[PDB]
Amino acid sequence: ALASAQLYSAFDFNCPCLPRYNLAYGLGVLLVPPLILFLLGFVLNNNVSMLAEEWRRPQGQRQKDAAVLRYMFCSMVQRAMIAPAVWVSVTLLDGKCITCAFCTSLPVEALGNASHHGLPQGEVKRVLARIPCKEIYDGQELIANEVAVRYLRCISQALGWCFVLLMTTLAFLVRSLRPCFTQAVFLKSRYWSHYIDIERKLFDETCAEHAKSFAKVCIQQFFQGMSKDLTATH
Amino acid sequence: ALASAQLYSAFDFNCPCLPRYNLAYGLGVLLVPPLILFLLGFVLNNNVSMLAEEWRRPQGQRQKDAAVLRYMFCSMVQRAMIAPAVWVSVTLLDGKCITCAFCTSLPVEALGNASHHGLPQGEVKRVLARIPCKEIYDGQELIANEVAVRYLRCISQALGWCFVLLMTTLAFLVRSLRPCFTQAVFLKSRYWSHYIDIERKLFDETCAEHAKSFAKVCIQQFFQGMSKDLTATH
Amino acid sequence: ALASAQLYSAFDFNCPCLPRYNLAYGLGVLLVPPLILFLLGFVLNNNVSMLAEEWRRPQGQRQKDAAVLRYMFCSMVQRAMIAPAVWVSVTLLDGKCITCAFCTSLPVEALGNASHHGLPQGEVKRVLARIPCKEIYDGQELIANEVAVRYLRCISQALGWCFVLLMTTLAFLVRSLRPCFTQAVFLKSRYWSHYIDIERKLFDETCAEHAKSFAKVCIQQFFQGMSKDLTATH
Amino acid sequence: ALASAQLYSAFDFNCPCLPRYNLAYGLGVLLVPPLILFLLGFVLNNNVSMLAEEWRRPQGQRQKDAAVLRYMFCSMVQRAMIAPAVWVSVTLLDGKCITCAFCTSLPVEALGNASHHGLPQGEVKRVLARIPCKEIYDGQELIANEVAVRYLRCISQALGWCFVLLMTTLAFLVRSLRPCFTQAVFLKSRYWSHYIDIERKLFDETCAEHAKSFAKVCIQQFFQGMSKDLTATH
Amino acid sequence: ALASAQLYSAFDFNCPCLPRYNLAYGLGVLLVPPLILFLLGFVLNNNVSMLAEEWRRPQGQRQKDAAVLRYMFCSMVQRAMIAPAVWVSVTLLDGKCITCAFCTSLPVEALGNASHHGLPQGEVKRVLARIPCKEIYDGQELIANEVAVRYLRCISQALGWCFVLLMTTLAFLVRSLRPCFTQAVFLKSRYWSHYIDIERKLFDETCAEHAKSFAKVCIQQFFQGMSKDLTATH
Amino acid sequence: ALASAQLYSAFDFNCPCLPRYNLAYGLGVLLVPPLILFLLGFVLNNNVSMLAEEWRRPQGQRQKDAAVLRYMFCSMVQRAMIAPAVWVSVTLLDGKCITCAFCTSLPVEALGNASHHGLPQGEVKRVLARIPCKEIYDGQELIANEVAVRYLRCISQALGWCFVLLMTTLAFLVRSLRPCFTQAVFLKSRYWSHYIDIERKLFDETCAEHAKSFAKVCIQQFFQGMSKDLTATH
Amino acid sequence: ALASAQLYSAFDFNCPCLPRYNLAYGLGVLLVPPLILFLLGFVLNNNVSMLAEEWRRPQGQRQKDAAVLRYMFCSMVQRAMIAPAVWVSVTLLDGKCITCAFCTSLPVEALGNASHHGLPQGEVKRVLARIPCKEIYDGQELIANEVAVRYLRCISQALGWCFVLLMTTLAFLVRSLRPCFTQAVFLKSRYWSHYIDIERKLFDETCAEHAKSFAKVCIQQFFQGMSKDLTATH
Amino acid sequence: ALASAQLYSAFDFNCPCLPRYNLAYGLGVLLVPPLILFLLGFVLNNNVSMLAEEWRRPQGQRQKDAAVLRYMFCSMVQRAMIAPAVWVSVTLLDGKCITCAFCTSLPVEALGNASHHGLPQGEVKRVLARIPCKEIYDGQELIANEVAVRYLRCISQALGWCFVLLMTTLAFLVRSLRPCFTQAVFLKSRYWSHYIDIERKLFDETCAEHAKSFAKVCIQQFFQGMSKDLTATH
Ligand SMILES: CCCCCCCC/C=C\CCCCCCCC(=O)O[C@@H](COC(=O)CCCCCCCCCCCCCCC)COP(=O)([O-])OCC[N+](C)(C)C
Ligand SMILES: CCCCCCCC/C=C\CCCCCCCC(=O)O[C@@H](COC(=O)CCCCCCCCCCCCCCC)COP(=O)([O-])OCC[N+](C)(C)C
Ligand SMILES: CCCCCCCC/C=C\CCCCCCCC(=O)O[C@@H](COC(=O)CCCCCCCCCCCCCCC)COP(=O)([O-])OCC[N+](C)(C)C
């Protein structure tokens, strides 16, 4: 979870100031890295195999239970949401992922300069699009680069807090209510966990103990056959 | 509690210098993050489920007691107030959350420049609003940017200390008085806590001990059936 | 105690250069933060409840003693004075809390420039008041900003050391004399402390031991009722 | 795995701005260091010898099993892919390895300057090739150096995330499915590991114990033969 | 002792360049902080009360001895001198505490400029006094500010080493000679220390052991009276 | 091994820009430091003496074995190659050791300026030789100093990776194949190691135990002969 | 010993450029701090009292021995020389303590400028004396300030190494020869040390054990006399 | 050994640019510090006394042996060479100790400027000598200061590596050959070491045990004679 925030510093955002690629490159940085951390939430878990080994059979003779599986699945999905939830928020509290996503859509005749200063309806996208990357901006007449960053960098943080609110309100709601939390079905899941754990621990003990009783018959053939006597003796 | 103060440095405040959005964006940074830490105070607690499982039934056959619940609820709410209390204070001891909230309301004909220098009653909001963000300020004639920050940044810290005073005086008052602190009802709550704890500890012992007595009948079927003899023996 | 000094660095002093608000904003930073740490000295203590539970009854049937309470009260007040004592001193060894408190009162015709250079008796407050905040000072003729800071920043440190002297001389005096230090009454207080401590420790032992004898009758109802047999057995 | 990322900082990339060598020097930094970490993944493993000692005999009398080997091989290859997978991604999230690979191929008459400004079809490679190394660039007329880095540095990160997605989706797929994961064959592999380990541990015990029973007959010949008496005695 | 040196860095010396206040503000920083650390040396000690409780009675029936007290007193005073001794030296090895103490007294017609350049006998104090604070110095003609700091900053360090010499020579003298060091009286003091220590340790044992035998009769009244039965039993 | 890389930072490379000394000073920094670490690999080992003590006799009556020695020798040589292998690579990934080795050999009429601009065939070495040390370069006309460093600094890193590839491919090959790895001869070597170790440990025990039985007869002659009585007794 | 070197950084050398005071202030920094560390070497030792208590009596009835004292004295003096030896060397390896000691004595007509350029035989001291403190130097004609520092700063380090040589040669000589190192007298000194140590350890045991047998009769008078009963019992 | 390298940073080299003193001051920094560390290698050893006590007698009745001494001596000398060996090398890998040693000897008519530009055969030493200390160099015509440092700073490092090679080749040679390494004589030396060690350990035990049996008769005379009764009893 903590690695989700620090890796954002390693990434070096930069938006290609082009008309139709901004909307692609912006959202992609917003949604795809979440999707990675979602799937990555499963492979790090250990019970993922049991579901596939169990859910693979479309015959109904499944071993564990019809209801315990639904619980264990719905539980594992919850502990996965934490990683992508952190990413989508902390990236929304910066604006850079959003400042160049919709930069080619804001209104200029409302908060910026006048409605028109002598440019067609096509170059406006050609000119507004370069709002980020404050080193090549040919639209200082149409709107100030310093202001148009404030208007958008602000709107981002609104979605930032309004997102974190709707997220925590959801955790507070499922953490204290019905969604497959029943007392009976809970004991089954917690019990089958210990069965899986002491199995692996108890198996390793018997195997190693079986070898030690068997390897000794081999190590008495390398010995007593080299020379049966050391020549280096004085 | 300590994470409430350090996260303020991670956030990068910046106020959109517009007439009617300041008052929105200012207060929102003041109140919403508190509301997050309030709800977050519950989900981190563990007894939250017991209340919902208990308070859900609107029938009166509740198990624990009619009075113990009211205590445990009123206790949990107290340990939640600490987080949002720290946020609302330390953010009030900076002014940035408040300097742009009411910047479009102070009087200019009292501490600033003269009463009027040739501007209508509409642009004053248009001009005063940009007092923060000291890079685009077209009102150096109407009031100095250096002074108008002092007048407001000062008034903030007054509410800062005056808030922390009324807060600590409240803690000192409830920490040594009546609010459901009775000796009898207290023992019930402290007793039902240990019942919940040694339950989980004592349950895990019996389950694991039950598996170990049962798994051994399975591990004697993988063994003694592979070959009953190692071929690698010399 | 140590947090009293370090928090001073977190606070960012700045004095609103106005005529009648300096005297308010100055002293407030001097006295109010002390008052916070005073009350905060009680809520962190644990015996505060016993006094309120005991001193509440205005009937005279108080349990502990008529004299032991007076000792325990007068003792707790002493260990509270340490925090505000550190604050009022270390803030007096800087002048910033005092340089703008009385900056509108010093004499100019004594150490500064000439007695009068052509200004009325009203603007002198209007002009002298801005002595701190060395970026907008319209009184370079009436007195040098570099000198008038020395005269006041010096007078502060006089009260600084003269305060710490009168403080330590008071600690040295009460630490080795009469103020309710009698041998008899002392043993009562030290004895009732251990009674309060081993009570809480001894109570938790019996309660937890009572549950463990009782929870076992419940955990034999979830078991032996699931199936009495594992289906996953080979 | 972690050393794969940090060593990238030690390496100091720099692309020789020549026409036909870019495409060589670029890909080489992309593919060769992966190939090193692949082979290096084997030599650090310990079971590599057993395969060669076993797979060397092309006669079919192999000792372990016909199926266990295929598992152990296919398992070892998996834990090797992690190192080169990290390299090829983190180097694709920078562009420098890719910005000079294809810099001599992008279109100029699409996103850059005009289609032609008076240069033949040969020097374009001669001029475009020096796009990186922003100190000797004789093509400021044909396309801006600041823009042409954005267009390519962006396209890299697309392959960056699109690579990491297809990678993690592959791990999630093989981590929960068929590829030689059968229960029977698994026990063989895990069992032959312990045999190899307790062998080395049990052999060292017997050898050292055999010497200690034998060395003592030698150390009684250096002693009792020096003088049988110390001369330094008083 | 070590805190005496480091606190000097926290203090921010600055000398008010006035005629008759230098001599006051200079010595005060030299002597007063010593006097604080002297008295502070007592309150941190623990035997201070015994002297006051003993020396208070002006009747001669004192308990301990007529001679042991004189030893214990003369011993405690010695371990106090270490703190102020460090302060007065390390502050003398800087000159700032002394450079502005006597700056208005040095001779100008000896090492500085000529004897007289056209100023009365009053302004010389008015002009020489501002020698420190090298930002407002109207006496560059009468003596160079760079030289007059060397002459005084040097004389300080002479008293610095000459002080530390006379100090260590005093410690070496009393550390190996007569001043109430007799063998007989020494054993009394060292013996009465252990009596005071094992007293407090042995008292706490009996009191706590007495409560535990008594509290149990109270904790059997909260129990067995709540309900004698848990309702939450299944 | 790790000290091989860090010591490179301590060394301060600098190439004497002369015609025929570059080729000497360059290669010397490349090959000689390797040769040091090779020989240093032996003296740090401990079995080096046994070979010399054994291989010295050119008579054939050698004690250990005719075959075990060849193994132990060929093993020790392998663990020595690691140090010089790291040096020759990491120094090839910088170019400075190679940029001035062959700087007087590259072609100028291929990638640099024109074929000839008015200089004989002798001064070209006189002029090209100073390509490194970019402070005295009299050949800005014949070829740019910025480009000619790229051409050579690049060619180095080609040999860098191409070297590390051929190295790791060699380790992977000998780590899993024939070169005196036979099972029989291996047990001899591993067995004679323990003999050497427990010998030194077992010898030190007997010697120290022999002295302690003998020193006691000496320490009863200094005692009981001083005076047989202390005079300081009271 | 190590504190002798680090304290040199704390001291801030600066030489008063005057004719006859240099020679004083220079040597004083060289010799006096040594003399401090010499005497300080004794007071930190513990056997210093025994000598004074023993050597005080000029009667010849001394207790320990006529010869053992001479050894213990000559031993303690040796372990004191280490501190001042380090100071006098490391301060000689800088020149600042010596560059201004003899700066008014070097020859100018030998390594500096010409023999005479128009100044009397008195001002030469007046002018040469200010050679250090390279901010006010009125002798740039008579000799360069940059050179005359080299000539003297060099001569210092000659005495630096030549001192450390004669010092270590002395330690090597006394560390392996006659100066009261005899075997007989050595055992006396080493024996009387243990007598002094186990005395203090054995005395503290008996005294504390004597109090504990005695304090108990006092603690049974504060108890059983308060009330013999707690009133707080329920 | 490691302190030999770090102390080089503490020393601040600087060469007095004079004709005949360079050759002195240069070599002195090269050879003398080695000679210090050589002698210092002995005094830190402990067996140095035994040799002097033994080798002092020129009579032939020496106690240990005629051959063991020669071994122990030749062994101790070896472990001393390590310190000065490190110094002479790491100082040769910088040139500063050598750049000003022979700076007044290199040829100018070979690698520098022309053979003669109008100066006699005497001033050449007068002018070449100041080659280091690149702030006063009056020979920019005769040879460039930047080049003449390269020519000499290079030649140093040749002797640097060529020295370390001949050194390590010597260690590798004596570490595996004849120089008094015989098996018989080795056991004597290793045996007499343990005799010396357990002697000191066993002596301290008997002496301390003898005092404890004797001090008790003294501590029963200070006790039972003070008063035989405490007066402070209640
Ligand atoms: C300071 C530290 C810095 C941190 C870094 C931060 C940045 C991080 C950025 C990114 C992180 C990305 C992580 C990737 C996923 C990791 C797991 C994995 O890969 O395992 C899989 C790999 O084995 C396979 O099955 C893949 C095989 C596909 C072939 C790929 C060709 C590679 C050669 C190149 C030729 C290219 C030519 C084409 C050119 C386009 C499966 O093996 P496993 O054993 O089952 O894995 C267990 C996984 N577990 C451990 C998670 C449980
Ligand atoms: C902060 C730290 C910095 C990190 C550094 C980061 C940078 C890293 C960069 C690069 C890392 C490169 C690592 C190399 C591989 C290492 C392993 C190895 O080499 O072992 C082999 C070496 O022994 C041989 O078999 C090779 C012999 C070939 C002769 C080479 C001539 C050398 C002389 C020069 C003349 C040249 C003249 C020609 C000039 C062109 C085999 O021995 P082993 O005992 O079986 O090895 C076990 C290996 N194990 C330990 C892995 C299990
Ligand atoms: C942060 C830390 C910095 C790291 C530093 C990095 C830089 C490192 C740079 C370089 C490292 C170089 C290391 C050198 C080799 C070390 C080992 C050695 O020397 O031992 C030998 C020395 O004893 C001898 O046998 C040599 C005697 C030759 C005489 C030399 C004259 C010296 C006086 C000067 C007059 C000159 C006059 C002429 C002027 C030209 C043998 O003794 P040993 O007991 O058998 O040794 C065991 C060795 N072992 C411990 C390895 C097992």
Residue numbers in the entry:
A (entry chain H), B (entry chain G), C (entry chain F), D (entry chain A), E (entry chain E), F (entry chain B), ...: 27 to 260
Task: Show passages lifted from the paper.
Calcium homeostasis modulator 1 (CALHM1) is a voltage-dependent channel involved in neuromodulation and gustatory signaling. CALHM1 is the recently identified member of a large-pore channel that permeates ions, including Ca2+, Na+, K+, and Cl−, and small molecules, such as ATP, in a voltage-dependent manner. Furthermore, the ATP efflux through the CALHM1 channel in type II gustatory cells and the subsequent purinergic signaling has been shown to facilitate the perception of sweet, bitter, and umami taste sensations. Our studies here showed that the human and chicken CALHM1s have a conserved structural fold, oligomeric assembly pattern, and a phospholipid-filled hydrophobic pocket for controlling channel functions.
To compare structures and assembly patterns of mammalian and non-mammalian CALHM1 channels, we determined the cryo-EM structure of human CALHM1, as well as that of chicken CALHM1 prepared using an identical protocol. Our single-particle cryoEM resulted in the octameric chCALHM1Δct and hCALHM1Δct structures, resolved at the overall resolutions of 3.36 and 3.76 Å, respectively. The overall protomer organization is similar between chCALHM1Δct and hCALHM1Δct (RMSD = 1.016 Å over 186 Cα positions), illustrating the structural conservation despite differences in amino acid sequences (72% identity and 90.6% similarity within CALHM1Δct). The structures of chCALHM1Δct and hCALHM1Δct are most similar within the TMD regions (RMSD = 0.826 Å; over 140 Cα positions), whereas that of CTH is more variable (RMSD = 1.294 Å; over 49 Cα positions). In our hCALHM1Δct structure, the cryo-EM density was resolved up to Pro85 but not Pro86. However, our chCALHM1Δct map allowed the modeling of residues 85-90 and revealed that these residues are located outside the center pore, indicating that Pro86 is likely not directly involved in the alteration of channel functions. In fact, many of the subunit interface residues at TMD2, TMD4, and CTH are conserved among human, mouse, chicken, killifish, and zebrafish orthologues (*). It is worth mentioning that we observed octameric and nonameric assembly as assessed by the ‘top’ views of 2D classification in both chCALHM1Δct and hCALHM1Δct; however, we could only 3D reconstruct the octameric channel as the majority of the particles belong to the octameric species. In contrast, the full-length chCALHM1 that was trypsinized post-purification displayed only octameric architectures. Inspection of the hCALHM1Δct and chCALHM1Δct structures reveals a hydrophobic pocket ~15 Å in length (parallel to the TMDs) and 10 Å wide, located between TMD3 and TMD4 of one subunit and TMD2 of the neighboring subunit. In both hCALHM1Δct and chCALHM1Δct, we observe phospholipid-like density nestled into this pocket, which appears to fortify the local architecture by interacting with the hydrophobic residues in the pocket.
